[PDB]
Design a protein around this nucleic acid. Structure first.
Ligand SMILES: [Mg+2]
Ligand SMILES: [Mg+2]
Lengths: 221, 186, 169, 143
RNA sequence: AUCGAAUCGCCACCUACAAGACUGGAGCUUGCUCCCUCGAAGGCGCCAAGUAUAUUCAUGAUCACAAGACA
RNA sequence: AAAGAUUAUCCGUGCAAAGCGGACGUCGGGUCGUUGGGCCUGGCGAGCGGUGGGUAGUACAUGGUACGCUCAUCACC
């Protein structure tokens, strides 16, 4: 994680600038857990670097009690002779998603671990990801197109909090502060947004006339 | 399935009903109430001019259709709550040991139930007002007052469930705390 | 409010060989199927459409169920629904998509210069306005430091450093 | 010694006032190939046959889309450890590099989702190329 | 400083939020009518800093990792 | 994690605000590339400091540190 002094020295000798790999950031809020994992697992195997946020807002079909009991049945499975080196049951919603993706990969091959190590999961949206670019969704894994709205569903964070996850309140407080800060920033920069809108509207009267007709033909004016 | 099922409700003059995303707010005199019905998946409309509330289920089988009459009853209860209120009268019935009920501000203490030394305490939420009738009029009566029928009930029910006889023949041991009158404040 | 599925309702076909064509509901079979027809479109004779493949529009002509072909044509012309629909933005976008799909490499170049020309003039207008009332990051920051810089640069010591190092240039 | 913030303020003052609405323009060497990724080889539950490779190309998601690329030349670009011989080794000495390329062609579409079958020249593509970038050029042109 | 590399879309307009049983706004008649910004585009970027008066490109000789890459 | 001449071109304060409050100078040289140019370096000062000399009271659990005043030295420089 933390760069070595040799790595920093080599970069300065090369004189290169800041580098960021092409990373897709997925907002997992109101996404079906299984369908999102299957889509993400295939993309990881195709060499994509994927970061998922708001894992605590994933959805599973059924009542919360039914899915809580499902996790508790998974929790009771452990190597009796030595619970260490036994099955490791992770309670955080981001680790639950990571485990779901891992079971959908060839995890016991080097290629499978290369795909798995290309995925980063978070609860909420941490500051290092907030300003990296627009977030994406998976339309075929979204709740409002996947579930019939009459059926009950569970939120992953609510299920995880009652089976051992201890940071439900921390994530909620951090997410509240993030949205207020983003809303305040978005309440500002409105003048900049409207200034460019009027600049595009006023520019129609300054460009050559035949260029306006071309824009109208292709539905841009 | 049935293409269109609907129920209608008339709104009195002094009360207004607002619906937005299956969230119903009923405002009248003596207070206001709000109900979250985002779990229902119904079509709620309010005709402000004609004072009608309508709930519609499109392409519903028996189970979804059973919910629209429940929705109408809930809105009707809210309308009654913000116009007349709800009053539950509770009587302490005992054979030998008097049931001493102490009612402080929002706090209820029950003592000497079947002679037990344990004190039963209940904290009434601020939306429900609990008062004890003067014994000169009617003996050992407790009155619960509030706008929400759901809240006024289960405040008396919680009181009833706290004074339950254990390890005895309940046919013979009839001591307890029972609701007697369900009425309106005004 | 969403537009109901009813006799006389105008719809647009979502997918399939009749994609992005407009028709009239004419009749309703059951919860899943209707009988769309549009006299003014050649490929839009009376036929069955699944309700999952239609998008109701804001226009409904006054026809009865299983109306005659002549009655639908008269109602469609009198209501001017097609003329009204063609003036909307979504109708224009559908025409624009067809124009881009059949476009050549030369027309794609023409659109590219047309959008670039508008982009250039939007910047010219924005920068002229940003000079008067600062709204961008560089003009707002410049205004935020002009008052402090003027106060600090007006000192006698700063003025001595002004000329003594400008003259070296 | 006078603090540098005095000279720094002057540079900042002139740059911010001289700033206009300018955008970054991509006027570098153009890209003449479609970007693709090697998914793997043709296979069943019994195992794989490495003489044929499967390549997924961005924006090619239909069998009709994949038919357009039948016959196109396909290139996989990697690097070795040392600088070895290449095309125009003596004609163009600037081309000498550790960069190497393996060349193939699209033989047929695969499935209904724009997947393509690619056969490489003589040998098979290395399995270390699975999940890596595959270049799908526009030649031989049919237009 | 070995080191030659594979990668080929930028942004200080997306990079805030929420809901798909209804989120542009009204009316009553509650599914129709009316108003509007007409409800199906994040903005740029693709070779003259902008649509015109223009201007070096070769012999790198017909494909070859773009022989180059701080947009 | 930060939040900007693309993280460079200062420090606080504030809400990724509106604003507001602060900042060591001066005299030369050398050496590279659009404005009081970057870097290196020397002489006079000043300030915040680190150690030691001489001195006074006080604090803390009372041998052992801190603090005032004043010299010398080093560092930012
Ligand atoms: Mg839905
Ligand atoms: Mg000096």
């Amino acid at each position: 994680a933390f760069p070595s002094r040799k790595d920093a020295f080599r970069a300065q000798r090369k004189g290169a600038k800041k580098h960021r790999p092409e990373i897709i950031v997925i907002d997992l809020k109101d996404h079906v857990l299984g369908r999102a994992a299957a889509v993400v697992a295939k993309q990881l195997l195709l060499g994509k670097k994927i970061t998922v946020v708001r894992c605590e807002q994933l959805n599973i079909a059924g009542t919360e009690i039914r899915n809580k009991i499902k996790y508790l049945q998974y929790l009771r499975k452990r190597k009796l002779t030595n619970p260490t080196k036994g099955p490791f049951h992770h309670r955080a919603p981001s680790d639950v998603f990571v485990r779901t993706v891992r079971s959908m990969l060839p995890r016991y091959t080097k290629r499978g671990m290369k795909a798995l190590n290309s995925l980063v999961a978070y609860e909420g949206i941490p500051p290092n990801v907030v300003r990296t670019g627009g977030r994406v969704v998976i339309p075929r894994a979204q709740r409002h197109v996947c579930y019939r709205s009459e059926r009950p569903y569970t939120v992953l964070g609510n299920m995880c909090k009652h089976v051992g996850w201890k940071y439900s309140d921390v994530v909620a407080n951090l997410e509240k502060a993030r949205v207020e800060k983003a809303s305040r920033h978005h309440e500002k920069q409105a003048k900049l947004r409207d200034a460019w809108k009027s600049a595009r509207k006023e520019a129609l009267a300054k460009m050559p006339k035949h260029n306006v007709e071309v824009l109208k033909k292709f539905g841009y004016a | 399935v049935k293409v269109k099922s609907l129920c209608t409700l008339q709104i009195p003059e002094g009360v207004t009903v607002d619906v937005k995303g299956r969230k119903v707010t009923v405002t009248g005199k003596r207070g206001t109430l709000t109900k979250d019905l985002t779990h229902l998946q119904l079509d709620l409309r309010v005709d402000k001019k004609n004072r009608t509330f309508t709930v519609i289920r499109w392409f519903g089988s028996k189970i979804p259709i059973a919910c629209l009459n429940t929705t109408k009853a809930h809105v009707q209860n809210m309308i009654t709550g913000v116009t007349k209120g709800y009053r539950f009268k509770v009587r302490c019935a005992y054979a030998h040991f008097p049931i001493n009920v102490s009612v402080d501000g929002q706090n209820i203490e029950v003592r000497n139930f079947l002679g037990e030394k344990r004190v039963r305490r209940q904290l009434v939420p601020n939306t429900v007002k609990v008062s004890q009738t003067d014994p000169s009029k009617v003996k050992d009566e407790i009155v619960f007052d509030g706008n929400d029928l759901e809240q006024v009930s289960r405040e008396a029910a919680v009181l009833h469930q706290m004074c339950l006889v254990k390890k005895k023949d309940i046919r013979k041991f009839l001591d307890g705390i029972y609701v007697q009158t369900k009425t309106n404040i005004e | 409010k969403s537009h109901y599925i009813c006799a006389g309702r105008l719809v647009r076909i979502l997918r399939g060989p009749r994609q992005d064509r407009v028709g009239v509901i004419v009749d309703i079979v059951d919860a899943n199927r209707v009988l769309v027809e549009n006299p003014e479109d050649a490929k839009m004779w009376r036929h069955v459409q699944n309700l999952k493949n239609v998008e109701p529009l804001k226009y409904c002509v006054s026809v009865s169920r299983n109306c005659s072909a002549k009655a639908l044509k008269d109602a469609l012309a009198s209501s001017k629904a097609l003329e009204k629909y063609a003036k909307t933005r979504t109708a224009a976008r559908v025409e624009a998509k067809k124009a881009c799909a059949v476009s050549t490499d030369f027309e794609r170049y023409q659109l590219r210069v047309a959008r670039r020309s508008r982009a250039h003039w939007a910047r010219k207008v924005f920068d002229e306005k940003d000079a008067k009332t600062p709204v961008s990051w560089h003009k707002v920051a410049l205004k935020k430091m002009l008052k402090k810089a003027a106060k600090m640069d007006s000192t006698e010591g700063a003025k001595r450093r002004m000329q003594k190092a400008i003259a070296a240039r | 010694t006078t603090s540098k913030v005095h000279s720094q303020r002057s540079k900042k003052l002139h740059q911010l006032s001289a700033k206009t609405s300018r955008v970054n323009r991509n006027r570098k060497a153009p890209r003449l190939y479609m970007k693709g990724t090697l998914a793997g080889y043709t296979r069943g539950l019994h195992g794989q046959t490495k003489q044929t490779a499967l390549v997924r190309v961005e924006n090619v998601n239909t069998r009709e889309d994949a038919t357009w690329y039948v016959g196109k030349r396909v290139c996989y670009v990697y690097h070795g450890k040392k600088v070895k011989r290449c095309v125009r080794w003596s004609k163009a000495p600037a081309r000498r590099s550790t960069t190497r390329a393996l060349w193939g062609r699209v033989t047929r579409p695969h499935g209904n989702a724009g997947m393509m079958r690619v056969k490489f020249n003589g040998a098979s593509v290395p399995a270390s190329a699975i999940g890596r970038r595959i270049r799908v050029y526009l030649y031989p042109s049919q237009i």
